[PDB]
């Protein structure tokens, strides 16, 4: 592992706060639940070997948008928006 990401919402408890180390990617996500409520989260997406998937998850719910990037702390600058309907 060699990548540092910002995290919030669900940080691994090996956090010096708002930082997880990973070998995969950094992510930020937005989702809205069954009432209009929208919650943010960010953290580490673990390296998945041959598999990888960030934007292309046709099975994922519609009211969810996630973005990925692979630079030290790249996800602070990250602001995913729900589609408009």
């Amino acid at each position, epitope marked *: 592992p060699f990548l540092k990401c910002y995290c919030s919402g*669900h940080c691994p408890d090996d956090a010096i706060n708002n930082t997880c180390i990973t070998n995969g990617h950094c992510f930020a996500i937005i989702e809205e639940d069954d009432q209009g409520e929208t919650t943010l989260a960010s953290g580490c997406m673990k390296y998945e070997g041959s598999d990888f998937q960030c934007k292309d998850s046709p099975k994922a719910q519609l009211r969810r948008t996630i973005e990925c990037c692979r630079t030290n702390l790249c996800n602070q600058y990250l602001q995913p928006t729900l589609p408009p309907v």
Partner: antibody, heavy 120, light 108 residues
């Protein structure tokens, strides 16, 4: 407050077909992937099938491919599973289940299943 | 492609239970855990390898590395007696795969 209710199970001979329905509510239905998952009495969970939210992507377990056709009607709020060429191995309690992703998919809400029992 | 859980695991009241789930390179896949009580639907308890849905007690945690994912129930109670299944996303036909599930007995 999500709800999911399976119906249409029951008895069938081998080679028969049944159609299972499951009625969704408490969520904007067409925004979510739905699954069929089953469980033979007192054995373990076996995943059967998914349809994407828009109904266009579809997927099956080898043990059912070609015999079962999943589908949905986003008009009603209803998910279906057409079970043909039934066998003893298909007897199981059937569950429909909603898919939801954070980073990756999980099934957050399940119906309470109908029993399908296949027997001559 | 194939998840292996021990059929049954038992603990004394109050003690920690560890339920394992193993398969080729499991630690490069995200694992999900369900608890299931007699007569009812399975219930989500852990969702990316280790997130708790709001409303599942802190008592439950999961971890995943190597070939092994683990559901850990700290100070466990009668009410925790149930079957637990692990699972993960398979690429066959683009579905999900379940462990054979394990029965947690809280020695009474």
């Amino acid at each position: 407050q999500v709800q999911l209710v399976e119906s249409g199970g029951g008895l069938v001979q081998p080679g028969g077909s049944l159609r299972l329905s499951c009625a969704a509510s408490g969520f904007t239905f067409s925004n979510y992937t739905l699954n069929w998952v089953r469980q033979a009495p007192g054995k373990g969970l076996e995943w059967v099938s998914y349809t994407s939210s828009s109904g266009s992507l579809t997927g099956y377990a080898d043990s059912v491919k070609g015999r079962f056709t999943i589908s949905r009607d986003n008009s009603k709020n209803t998910l279906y599973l057409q079970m043909n060429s039934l066998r003893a191995e298909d007897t199981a309690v059937y569950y429909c289940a909603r898919e939801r992703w954070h980073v990756r998919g999980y099934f957050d809400h399940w119906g309470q299943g109908t029993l399908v029992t296949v027997s001559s | 492609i194939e998840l292996t859980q021990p059929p049954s695991v038992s603990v004394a009241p109050g003690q920690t239970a560890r339920i394992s789930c193993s398969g080729d390179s499991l630690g490069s896949k995200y694992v999900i855990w369900y608890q299931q009580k007699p007569g009812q639907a399975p219930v989500l308890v852990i969702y990316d390898d280790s997130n708790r849905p709001s409303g599942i007690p802190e008592r439950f945690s999961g971890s995943n590395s190597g070939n092994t994912a683990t559901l850990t129930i700290s100070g466990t109670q009668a009410e925790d007696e149930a079957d637990y299944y692990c699972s993960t996303f398979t690429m066959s036909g683009n579905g999900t795969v379940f462990g054979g599930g394990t029965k947690l007995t809280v020695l009474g």
